[PDB]
Amino acid sequence: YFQSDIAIVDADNPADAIQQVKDLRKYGAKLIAYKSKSSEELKLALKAGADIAIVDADNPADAIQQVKDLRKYGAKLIAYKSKSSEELKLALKAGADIAIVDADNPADAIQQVKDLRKYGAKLIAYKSKSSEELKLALKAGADIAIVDADNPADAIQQVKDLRKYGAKLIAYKS
């Protein structure tokens, strides 16, 4: 939370969210991201002191509505995650700031990064337990490296490795 630029919360309920935000906010974390399938929960998280609202909606119609609800509410940093680069572009066209690439497949995921970079996406994020795959995503034009290690030791080493490589924005999921 010191070496990382962004702290990502899942917390499975609102009251956990406003508590987990308050924990991070007072003690360590700089930028706080919160993910939810509920735009109303995301609004509460932002009010509680989160910086980045990650829209988690599985269907494009719901995603566009949620991005627009958060844009009107005054959200400053809206992110959307999809396995579809078409759907990520829909979220950018609705006013999302951050496209999070989430293809199940390193070849495919790295191509989504190139396609989003070609498209002109301002901020692309990429998640991996492979620090070497995160370096390939950054060369391909990703801006945010999301560490996804299976334990604390591997997470701490991924952050160190990506700093030395030159990663400007590193995110960690608690």
Author numbering: -3 to 170
Task: Share the article's original sentences.
Here, we investigate the capability of a deep neural network model to automate design of sequences onto protein backbones, having learned directly from crystal structure data and without any human-specified priors. To assess whether the model could perform sequence design for de novo structures, we tested our method on a Rosetta-generated four-fold symmetric de novo TIM-barrel backbone, a (βαβα)4 topology consisting of an eight-stranded barrel surrounded by eight alpha helices.
In the structure, we see that the C-terminal His tag for F2C interacts with the surface of the beta-barrel, which might also contribute to the dislodging of the C-terminal helix, although 3 of the 4 symmetric subunits are folded as expected. Since the structure is a closed toroid, the N- and C-termini are proximal, and we see that the N-terminal tag is partially resolved folded against the barrel, displacing the C-terminal helix.
